[PDB]
Ligand binder design. Structure first.
Ligand SMILES: O=c1ccc(CN2CCN([C@H]3CC[C@@H](c4cccc(C(F)(F)F)c4)CC3)CC2)c[nH]1
Ligand SMILES: O=c1ccc(CN2CCN([C@H]3CC[C@@H](c4cccc(C(F)(F)F)c4)CC3)CC2)c[nH]1
Ligand SMILES: [Ca+2]
Lengths: 614, 614
């Protein structure tokens, strides 16, 4: 958790004590090549002693890039280079690593010439990909050399038996490490160099078709981490051009790793299922934007709006089935205490025998069957994915996959409330209408006009109104309790705005939004400490809190106005792919033209053409 | 429609199969001039075979700019250059075209030297001016040469019999093609070169007075497409200067093609009758801004505001004629069921015999005659123009040409409702007053103060309030149905805010805008599921939806604040010209001074003078 930082830093301090109380090893921290020549020549002053992190005297000579003190330890001890560190923080790191990390060294001549091992995996905990190590350099020695942009070490290291195809404990190869580097441009140049040494290809999956232990090619990994620049360079192999015609030209894109091939994941699946921001920016690039906007124009909006009309037809025969709820006059003759009760219907229990009530038995049997169809296409998607996917990817957009569960759950209650004839049946029917109709708004994303205005709401309910509601809640029960002990010494027959304490909570909340009338009788003197504390209420309620909330809502609008126009194009892809998965193969043709008729293979293709002025 | 793209791209793939299964023709795609020399020398290996798009082996040698493979096909086949392509996509395109499109070639030496035809019209469907071809290059070979900015082909091609004055199937000449190019600056230079080769002028309409099949000169076409830069260069011939005097100077403008000459269209007519945005920017240029602002200052505002005072005097004697509507006491003695009906007048039918009611017979005969005058000056403008002109140019400004039809239509109803004495006569009179008075706002454009604030409304009613009204409509009948099944088990004598379902639709809509009081009785316990769902209503109604709508309305204001100040100057020209067309010649003098007194001709003129510091 947190004390792991408190144990890591003490290792760094403990090194400086072991570098201090050690005679030859402090001479290794400096040059001291006259003294370290003499400090070695003794009876029992062995070089295998280790500091805090389990480190030899050669490493310290390397870690402070002292070449003269390095070679004397090699000349006096030939076994010393075969020696990795043995801490739990650093582990398996040899002396070849550090001279490579310092990116400019002639010691890499010497350590290679004394037959160092170029396959020492450095799987210590200071090298795993986590947001606590500030580097991610991989494990192998040539993996470090590429990672710090030093070609002259890479060409030297590959010449003496370095294996390109060596993966890591994370599973990634040399080239996956190059994608998620922060210094993006210098990786793209040297990516071309590392690809060249793959020749003869080992007659199988040559270099950049191999997945990792998490299961991605280098091309797909460029998508998810959001490296925009490397995604440009990886399309250069994948596309190949056609005829050119003045300033007009046309190309073909490979497309074999974009759309859904089978049950395997696609790239467009991986883009929308991440929490990052830079990754979703990749949609506007030239071989993917054409694929999306063609996919939603000819097979999108028809099969979305026809899903829209069915669902609007569903609730309009649920609401019509609702308001014909059966009743009867009441038979208990104005029971528990009178004049402060008014209800007079007390729900009918089982009488359907009517030539009219048969029609509701159709309409009830419409919406209950509809509640079963909702639960059969979401509950199989809960168990197939993780449990934290629906609270998981909800920020892209996911309240609507929670509401339409709760809509189906409440309709499934009101038939259990009907089959045994309970009393309080107006509770789930009330939630059914408010949660039902607000899921019409799920279809308010396949339209340009009332599109991104929906996303502006979701980014504000889980936004400034959640921010405002707390400081609304603290004041609203502050003054209400201060109102309640004023009018408690009063008869509520006239100006009984609040007689009971769970009404002054409600009668102040209505008053805070100015949707009720403000308490006045004008006929009898309502008490004095009302009229001072009501005026002091209305200043910090109507004149301050209510319309500060429009000021910060106006300010928070334009500072996300460019982000929401990306959120919409992100949401429209996620509607397309989710619509793609459920529709069968008898509908929904695959996008783009095919092979097997043109001498291209089994892979599909897409073309596009444009003007490239000069 | 859309599958025409699905048939176009398959032609491009089918070419790559025909380039593949053809031995000499693939050798034409590369150079292969050693092999193609031998591939021709056979018995039956003729060169007239055609690929997918009906194309010969010379074209493929041209389309991949292979000069060596081009000349061997000419040397072995002299007839081969006389050969256009025969697809439906490309049609009539010869081998001279492609070497010209590639803009740098020595094959245009050779194809001309073997007597190619420089008048092969390429009227295939991949060359028509439509928003699906990314080019518009015209049809003729020198038309292509100018279009890609290569003078050295133009001077070569004009020297061997090229005809400048050759129009196209669209009707446009060489020079109309130069105006609507996208690379604007390079057209303006070479426009001067193409004008030079018109000499001897063919003693009639020399080069840039000829219209097209759509009917425009090059000067007027520069207006409508909105090419600002070419409009500067075309005024250089048209104006001619006068005396210069230090930093002060004065010029004259030609003006013979700006104002309305006769029944023919003017340029100012063509500017306001387009849907584009760049074209309406041309108004601020120096020979047109002076013409407008002088035209509206001395013959504008008088004949606009006098139209304003007549119309305000019209409705103020319609409203005065309205509220003296005749009545009587009622004679049916409180019919169909009592206490839930209140009306007590039941309109008088034909009695006008009164010394006072004669005055209304004047006032009724004022406004009915006024309704006839409205219909006699718009219905002749429907049939003379297209039917989709009033829904057509309405975005510039046109609701007011629809309302004042509907005003006249409703007043014409209420006399038919009077001549046969129907009952429900308050319906068209009510629409007459609300639609009548809102057409006073048509005159709110000839004033600086309450000017562009009108256009801010039209860009918002057909804007964010149309955006807001849908998500207002979905919630407003959501909660209302949820309110209706709560108070259905209640006697509406006390807190009968809504008893019937087409009142809870209305009583919630009033409540959503907080213009009613909020339901409270404080005396009898109104039910529990009200008070929870009312508070959850008011948060996403008064605190969220209502005042988000002011936040996005504040944000959408300043991002069109510069556009509306162009819309106003656009609207004021359209008021001037529409006022110009209807007023006779006995009024409204033509703008600017005349000829025939100064040795200038029959054309009119305008002058202006300014300072040109250094
Ligand atoms: O008695 C009750 C108690 C709670 C409620 C809850 N309603 C239901 C609808 N939304 C909820 C659920 C959906 C979610 C939401 C609403 C509107 C628009 C969006 C979005 F995402 F489209 F912006 C999301 C938040 C509150 C407002 C309150 C009604 N009635
Ligand atoms: O019972 C009804 C039913 C419909 C109506 C329609 N009115 C009529 C007037 N405008 C309409 C028509 C004009 C148009 C408009 C109004 C004001 C200002 C402008 C503009 F263009 F100047 F901004 C345009 C839109 C709604 C509001 C509603 C009234 N009464
Ligand atoms: Ca009130």
């Amino acid at each position: 958790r947190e004390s792991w930082a408190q144990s890591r830093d003490e290792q760094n301090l403990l090194q400086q004590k072991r570098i201090w109380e050690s005679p030859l090893l402090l001479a290794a921290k400096d040059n001291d090549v006259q003294a370290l020549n003499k400090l070695l020549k003794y009876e029992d002053c062995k070089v295998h002693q280790r500091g805090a992190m389990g480190e030899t005297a050669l490493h310290i000579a390397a870690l402070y890039d002292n070449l003269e003190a390095a070679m004397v330890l090699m000349e006096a001890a030939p076994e010393l280079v075969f020696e990795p560190m043995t801490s739990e923080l650093y582990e398996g790191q040899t002396a070849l690593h550090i001279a490579v990390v310092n990116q400019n060294m002639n010691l890499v001549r010497a350590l290679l010439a004394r037959r160092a091992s170029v396959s020492a995996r450095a799987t210590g905990t200071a090298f795993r990909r986590s947001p606590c190590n500030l580097i991610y350099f991989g494990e192998h020695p040539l993996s470090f050399a590429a990672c710090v942009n030093s070609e002259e070490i890479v060409r030297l290291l590959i010449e003496h038996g370095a294996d390109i195809r060596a993966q890591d404990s994370l599973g990634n190869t040399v080239l996956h490490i190059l994608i998620l580097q922060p210094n993006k441009t210098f990786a793209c140049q040297m990516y071309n160099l590392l690809l060249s040494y793959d020749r003869h290809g080992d007659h199988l999956q040559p270099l950049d078709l191999v997945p990792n232990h998490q299961g991605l090619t280098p091309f797909k990994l460029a998508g998810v981490e959001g490296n925009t620049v490397m995604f440009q360079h990886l399309m250069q192999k994948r596309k190949h051009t056609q005829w050119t015609y003045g300033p007009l030209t046309s190309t073909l894109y490979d497309l074999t790793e974009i759309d859904s091939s089978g049950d395997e994941q696609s790239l467009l699946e991986l883009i929308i299922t991440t929490k990052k921001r830079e990754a979703r920016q990749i949609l506007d690039q030239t071989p993917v934007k054409e694929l999306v906007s063609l996919k939603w124009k000819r097979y999108g909006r028809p099969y979305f709006c026809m899903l829209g009309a069915i669902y609007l037809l569903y609730i309009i025969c649920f609401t019509m089935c609702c308001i014909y709820r059966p009743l009867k006059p009441r038979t208990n003759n104005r029971t528990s205490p009178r004049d402060n009760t008014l209800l007079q219907q007390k729900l009918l229990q089982e009488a359907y025998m009517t030539p009219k009530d048969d029609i509701r038995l159709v309409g009830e049997l419409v919406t209950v069957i509809g509640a079963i169809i909702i639960l059969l296409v979401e509950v199989p998607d809960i168990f197939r994915m993780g449990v934290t996917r629906f609270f998981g990817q909800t920020i892209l957009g996911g309240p609507f996959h929670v509401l339409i569960i709760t809509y189906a759950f409440m309709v499934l209650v009101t038939m259990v409330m009907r089959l045994i004839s309970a009393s309080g049946e107006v509770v789930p029917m009330s939630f059914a209408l408010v949660l039902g109709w607000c899921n019409v708004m799920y279809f308010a994303r396949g339209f340009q006009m009332l599109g991104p205005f929906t996303i502006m709401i979701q980014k504000m309910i889980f936004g400034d109104l959640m921010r405002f509601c707390w400081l609304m809640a603290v004041v609203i029960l502050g003054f209400a309790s201060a109102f309640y002990i004023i009018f408690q010494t009063e008869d509520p027959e006239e100006l009984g705005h609040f007689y009971d304490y769970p009404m002054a909570l409600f009668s102040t909340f209505e008053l805070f939004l100015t949707i009720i009338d403000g308490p006045a009788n004008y006929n009898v003197d309502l008490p004095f400490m009302y009229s001072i504390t009501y005026a002091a209420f209305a200043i910090i309620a109507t004149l301050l809190m209510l319309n500060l909330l429009i000021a910060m809502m106006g300010d928070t609008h334009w500072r996300v106005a460019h982000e929401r126009d990306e959120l919409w194009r992100a949401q429209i892809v996620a509607t397309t792919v989710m619509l793609e998965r459920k529709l069968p193969r008898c509908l929904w043709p695959r996008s783009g033209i095919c092979g097997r008729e043109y001498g291209l293979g089994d892979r599909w293709f897409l073309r596009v053409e444009d003007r490239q002025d000069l």
